[PDB]
């Protein structure tokens, strides 16, 4: 039995990694992810300069998941580049870096700095097109003209295979429009579906008050809320972008959800809210649970069922 | 305490009604809604000609809500107009009709027929801009140019106060854009937030198969999945459209959820998945539970706390 994944020139021990933003902001965070049983890890979505993010409280755990408006707190691109170049143990597992400049000009500058490190170390880029908690900045993925600009400029500046973190789409027309843009950029090798369901609102009935401070309580939803949306996006892009990989992100708490993501077409599976709740020990549990499901169904590899969801 | 709502010249006994599509397709359905303790009712989203809708299975109840791809099965506009004109007991409660033509032309033809019945009986129009389960028909509400056309032509053709059923939005820029369109049409007196979270996917791990037949398993999500999205949309439009009412729809299972909707700014509160689960007895329960919360908090009327959610 094997959870191994062969993509992007690497052998991943298993399909699991952290979702960008969870357990990956500091050196200590990244150490714990590297020491975990995860198949990979991704750094916090970074900007050209450091950010401390939004005021508190900006995170609230829910029965059915989480709401957050973190506001992209990060140590700046130079920190994560230095981590990728000097600190990270590539013998343990491959490294992704998430980059989320607040303009195309910022992104271009950032990805240019990554080029030499990708060439030297093999660090992988995930371009974030769906940061929903920065006041005054719309999610790039919801504007297909802006998305096309970003992909053109980053393709030009970076010039190596990279991936994109997409916001969730809720309309067949949007899947079609999104795929049409993505399919025009051959350097986009993977699509991560999905980021948080943006701009939800949670109110405490007792004090009649919102539970987070930023943006009048509006924040991104994660966890059990997002699983059906996540599976739909994974499967939609799996079918619409056959020349690209799809990574699943959203609502993974168990091997069962991981199995569903992979069945829908996911190559790798990212874990956000559940990891925030449980800590990096979750990866050991997820490996065991996924292996259990496969044993019960008589599958030896992930390849036996990846993307083999049945329709009626 | 009083649950009464006084809007559009009508007295509503309480803020509760069915969500369009649930318990409102047939004459018997509408009878049961009229007999219930609900403050109002709305007819199934109808088309110019009858429709039998999508093939089976097209509905699946979930632990956390529902997925459906009904495909607007309805008896045609003539049936609902006849119900509104001849059958409905207006002494029991006011009636809304939902109209969901698959083109602006169809919608215009339908609303023209309603005009004399509105004038005579006081039937209220909810124009559906968010039908997500018709193959080849995108949700109108996600195209602001198309939305503007619909509101223009329907405003002209109907010429009386009406409301709109909106799809959920997930970006602040979209709230701004939607509100800019809506605020140009003074005849739009209410906004219903929200329709289903469109195009989710549920997969059964046992048989590795999607749970509904239409559109490769893709269907609208309702129930516990949608509450934070619903509250966000209600509050966003409550603040952006001060010349209009907002109706809340999504994730109502209890008086507590109803309270949150009203706190967010809802005038009426619609019940979909929970009503499908429980039957029209739910309306008696909802009245009791909301009265209890208001008694506990010392609120004499809904107007004491409507839209008075606190931010930090
Ligand atoms: C605290 C927190 C921080 C996050 N930070 C980022 C981030 O920096 N970049 C990003 O692309 N997504 C970020 N996300 C979104 C997650 O990567 C993920 O897409 C989302 O939480 C859905 O997965 P889940 O259901 O497992 O939580 C963050 C989510 C949380 C809860
Ligand atoms: C079986 C079913 C049929 C529906 N039919 C319609 C419809 O005809 N028109 C409409 O605007 N919404 C329709 N909806 C959406 C609901 O009106 C409502 O917006 C959605 O279910 C969210 O509310 P809930 O969380 O209480 O279910 C339907 C939903 C379900 C579950």
From Swiss-Prot, chains A, B:
Alphabetized GO MF terms: dihydroorotate dehydrogenase (fumarate) activity; dihydroorotate dehydrogenase activity
Active site positions: 131 (nucleophile)
UniProt-annotated binding residues for substrate: 44, 68-72, 128, 133, 195-196
Pathway(s) annotated for this protein in UniProt: Pyrimidine metabolism; UMP biosynthesis via de novo pathway
Record-annotated membrane-spanning stretches: none
pH profile of the protein: Optimum pH is 7.8.
The keyword Chloroplast appears for this protein: no
Cell location: Cytoplasm
Alphabetically ordered keywords of this record: Cytoplasm, Flavoprotein, FMN, Oxidoreductase, Pyrimidine biosynthesis
Domain of life: Eukaryota
Pfam families given in the database record: DHO_dh
Coiled-coil segments: none
Catalytically driven reaction(s): (S)-dihydroorotate + fumarate = orotate + succinate
GO BP: 'de novo' pyrimidine nucleobase biosynthetic process; 'de novo' UMP biosynthetic process; fumarate metabolic process
Cited InterPro entries: Aldolase_TIM, DHO_dehydrogenase, DHOD_1A, Dihydroorotate_DH_1_2, Dihydroorotate_DH_cat
SUPFAM superfamilies for this protein: FMN-linked oxidoreductases
Keyword Cytoplasm: yes
Gene3D superfamilies reported for this sequence: Aldolase class I (3.20.20.70)
Cofactor-binding details, from the entry: Binds 1 FMN per subunit.
Function: Catalyzes the conversion of dihydroorotate to orotate with fumarate as the electron acceptor. Molecular oxygen can replace fumarate in vitro.
Name of the protein this chain belongs to: Dihydroorotate dehydrogenase (fumarate)
């Amino acid at each position: 039995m094997s959870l191994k994944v062969n993509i992007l020139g690497h052998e991943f021990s298993n399909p699991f990694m952290n979702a960008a933003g969870v357990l990956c902001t500091t050196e200590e965070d990244l150490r714990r992810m590297t020491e975990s049983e995860s198949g990979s890890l991704i750094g916090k979505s970074c900007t050209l300069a450091p950010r401390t993010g939004n005021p508190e409280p900006r995170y609230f755990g829910l029965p059915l998941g989480s709401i957050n408006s973190m506001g992209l707190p990060n140590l700046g691109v130079d920190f994560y580049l230095s981590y990728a170049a000097q600190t990270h143990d590539y013998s343990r597992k491959p490294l992704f870096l998430s980059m989320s400049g607040l303009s195309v000009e910022e992104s271009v500058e950032m990805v240019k700095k990554l080029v030499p490190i990708t060439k030297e170390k093999g660090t992988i880029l995930e371009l974030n097109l769906s940061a929903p908690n920065v006041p005054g900045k719309p999610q790039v993925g919801y504007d297909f003209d802006t998305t096309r600009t970003y992909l053109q400029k980053v393709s030009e500046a970076y010039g190596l295979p990279f991936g994109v973190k997409m916001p969730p789409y809720f309309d067949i027309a949007h899947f079609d429009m999104a795929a049409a843009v993505l399919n025009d950029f051959p350097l986009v090798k993977f699509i991560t579906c999905v980021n948080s369901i943006g701009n939800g609102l949670v109110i405490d009935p007792a004090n009649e008050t919102v539970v987070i401070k930023p943006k009048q309580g509006f924040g991104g939803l994660g966890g059990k809320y997002v699983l059906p949306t996540a599976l739909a996006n994974v499967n939609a892009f799996f079918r619409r972008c056959p020349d690209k990989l799809v990574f699943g992100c959203g609502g993974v708490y168990s091997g069962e959800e991981a199995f569903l993501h992979i069945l829908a077409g996911a190559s790798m599976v990212q874990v956000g809210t559940a990891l925030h709740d449980e800590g990096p020990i979750i990866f050991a549990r997820l490996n065991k649970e996924l292996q259990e499901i496969m044993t019960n169904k008589g599958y030896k590899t992930l390849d036996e069922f990846r993307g083999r969801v049945k329709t009626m």
